[PDB]
């Protein structure tokens, strides 16, 4: 409603770096808000794509940003009559960033790993990795829970059970208020998908450079499954957290499995022990139901509500014809211990191939009416097909069926404007929450400031 679409702020990065593929707000020790941006194709030392992370300070005019430096050299450790290897080429560092406290977590979902023992090997596979940083202090740390030292032959004998060689940890990420990092790994357990949790404080205190393989006793990974319903479901394609069991001491995880049950797609709510509390099934096959999940209380009843995006949903139209537009589902949490019923509201896209639902960002209370609001991206929507972000306002009955505001893309075609979003943070300190939008196709980030309501 009251986002300023006239005077935007534009940050930018190297060409072809996909700057803006991921972003999040970041407050230092003094509360000074910044913007961390990921560029998963930034050039490395050997003029080869390795990705990178930038930490943009707030400036109403925007501009260029400084790099948040990480180690981009391949590592090797000969130990235990084995040879450990890390390959950061094409790793995609910055394919997902998230901030908590004064710490930044940037992940490289396709960092490869291989263990050599004489003539055998564990196979070179993308286990993924996440780089953690405390910008003010300069501290650095890493977390790669899916690394292993088991050889290829062993997996074959065991029928490829508990195979964490293709996790791609960091594909999605979130951090609980308590400080527990949760990494989605849609390739874990032979493309079933796993989660991996671990306290940030324990990641830092247990990391030392060069070790490559170290223990984080307090971590907690999810479990394999012999169920064909979970096969090739990419469990962990998208992750979030919230409160869905009433007990405020526990933190519940939300996970997206967009190809679950033979591309029917689903999303499950769990506890910190990965025990499924609820499961929400896709409405249509190959709609990628679960591509993006969001948690926020939209009806102002204290209870977090769930929002799920199915970017490729094909709406039914006249003469028995289907049109890919996308869709978003709203699930309101019921009072006390009760299951989440049918979706309270269906938001369907308009622009063909627009992928309405490819991202969903809680905005907080934008118009300050007491109900939290959201922003839905259509990276290829709008009458021009350049991009579009639609703001839906909260209300007692859930959400408004129609958008209060639409943000058309200031970038050219192919910018993927809206592929990433983030809101609910007041960056200019004017009392209203603001929205940042990424456009990795144009290597830029567009900050929308929220102004007092005009009406």
């Amino acid at each position: 409603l009251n986002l300023d679409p006239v005077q935007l702020t534009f940050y930018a990065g190297p060409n072809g770096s996909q700057f803006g593929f991921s972003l999040d707000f970041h407050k230092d020790s003094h509360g000074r808000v910044a913007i961390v941006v990921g560029a998963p194709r930034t050039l490395g030392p050997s003029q080869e794509e390795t990705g990178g992370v930038f930490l943009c300070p707030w400036r109403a005019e925007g501009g260029q940003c400084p790099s948040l430096l990480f180690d981009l050299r391949d590592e090797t450790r000969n130990v235990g009559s084995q040879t450990l290897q890390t390959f950061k080429a094409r790793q995609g560092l910055g394919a997902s960033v998230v901030s908590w406290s004064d710490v930044i977590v940037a992940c490289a979902p396709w960092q490869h790993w291989n263990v050599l023992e004489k003539t055998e090997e564990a196979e070179k596979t993308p286990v993924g990795s996440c780089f953690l940083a405390q910008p003010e202090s300069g501290r650095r740390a890493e977390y790669s829970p899916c690394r292993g030292n088991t050889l290829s032959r062993i997996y074959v004998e065991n029928d490829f059970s508990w195979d964490k060689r293709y996790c791609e940890a960091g594909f999605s990420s979130v951090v609980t208020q308590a400080g527990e990092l949760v990494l989605g790994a849609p390739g874990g357990y032979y493309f079933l998908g796993l989660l991996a949790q671990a306290p940030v404080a324990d990641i830092f205190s247990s990391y030392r450079p060069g070790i490559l393989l170290w223990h984080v006793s307090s971590q907690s990974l999810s479990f394999d499954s012999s169920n064909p319903e979970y096969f090739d479901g990419y469990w962990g394609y998208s992750v979030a957290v919230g409160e869905f069991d009433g007990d405020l001491n526990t933190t519940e995880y939300v996970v997206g499995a967009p190809t679950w049950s033979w591309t029917l797609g689903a999303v499950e709510i769990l506890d910190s022990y990965y025990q499924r509390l609820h499961r929400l099934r896709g409405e249509q096959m190959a709609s990628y139901f679960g591509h993006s999940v969001a948690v926020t209380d939209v009806n102002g009843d204290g209870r977090h509500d769930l929002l799920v995006g199915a970017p490729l949903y094909m709406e039914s139209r006249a003469d028995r014809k289907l049109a890919e537009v996308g869709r978003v589902y709203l699930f309101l949490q019921p009072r006390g211990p009760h299951a989440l019923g049918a979706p309270s509201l269906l938001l369907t896209g308009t622009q063909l191939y627009g992928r309405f639902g490819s991202a969903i960002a809680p905005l907080g209370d934008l118009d300050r009416d007491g109900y939290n609001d959201i922003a839905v991206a259509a990276p290829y929507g709008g009458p021009s097909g350049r991009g579009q972000v639609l703001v839906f306002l909260g209300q007692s009955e859930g959400l408004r069926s129609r958008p209060s505001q639409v943000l058309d893309s200031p970038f050219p075609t192919g910018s993927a404007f809206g592929f990433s979003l983030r809101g609910a943070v007041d960056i200019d300190d004017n009392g209203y929450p603001d929205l940042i939008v990424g456009a990795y196709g144009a290597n830029q980030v567009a900050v929308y400031r929220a102004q007092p309501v005009v009406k």
Epitope: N78, N149, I211, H215
Partner: antibody
Framework: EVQLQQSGAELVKPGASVKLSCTAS????????VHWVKQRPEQGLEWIGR????????KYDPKFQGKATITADTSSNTAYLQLSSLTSEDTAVYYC????????????WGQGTSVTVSS | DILMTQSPSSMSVSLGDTVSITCHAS??????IGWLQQKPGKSFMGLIY???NLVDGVPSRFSGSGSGADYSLTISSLDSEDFADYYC?????????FGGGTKLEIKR
């Protein structure tokens, strides 16, 4: 806190078989590798072998192959070391070891089990 | 098997001194070395791992160093408890092999 409660001292006769234990306290035995080390005053320290309690795979020093046999039961949260066809040279103190962070290190040690072989 | 020549076998020193134990390997081990302490009539305690990294709870006066095949443990400002046995252990290759040992004795 990580502590490795090893079994009490053993006193057996030559030619018999003994089985030492190494119960874990404050953590799951299944977390890390578990090594066994033999210590003698003159000879010094000797690495027997290791075991991954999660899967049961093991490695041994070719000096103790046949003599030493390491096992582990995740249920009781304990790891074992069996020594067959004992002799006088098998008179030594035996320690169970696990690493702290590094996968391949030797940081935490039990109190040790004293073994004496004599008729 | 890798041989670990640990020297000296013993040294007589006093409190507050700064001593340095060395450990020589039959081949390169790239910082894959650990240092241990055994107080008299007691079990072992971890001091160092991967060359230079201290084990949690260890005083900062301890410090490892070195590379290739030659490494060294250094204790700055000796304390009364520091008088004990000390061993080095390589885990670059299987089987793991320890050093001869070094006993810190009180001088007089």
């Amino acid at each position: 806190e990580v502590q490795l409660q090893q079994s009490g001292a053993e006193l057996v006769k030559p030619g018999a078989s003994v089985k030492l234990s190494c119960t874990a306290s404050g953590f799951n035995i299944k977390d890390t590798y578990v090594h066994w080390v033999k210590q003698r005053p003159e000879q010094g320290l000797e690495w027997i072998g290791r075991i991954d309690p999660a899967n049961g795979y093991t490695k041994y020093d070719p000096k103790f192959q046949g003599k030493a046999t390491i096992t582990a039961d995740t249920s009781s949260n304990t790891a074992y070391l069996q020594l067959s066809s004992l002799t006088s040279e098998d008179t030594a103190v035996y320690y169970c070891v696990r690493p702290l962070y590094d996968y391949y290190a030797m940081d935490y040690w039990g109190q040790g089990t004293s073994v004496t072989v004599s008729s | 098997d890798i041989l670990m020549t640990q020297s000296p076998s013993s040294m007589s020193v006093s409190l507050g001194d700064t001593v340095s134990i060395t450990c020589h390997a039959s081949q390169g081990i790239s910082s894959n070395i650990g240092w241990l302490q055994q107080k008299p009539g007691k079990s072992f305690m971890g001091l160092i791992y991967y060359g230079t990294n201290l084990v949690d709870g260890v005083p900062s006066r301890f410090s490892g160093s070195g590379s290739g095949a030659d490494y060294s443990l250094t204790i700055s400002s000796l304390d009364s408890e520091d008088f004990a046995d000390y061993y080095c252990v390589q885990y670059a290759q299987l089987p793991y092999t320890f050093g001869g040992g070094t006993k810190l004795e009180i001088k007089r």
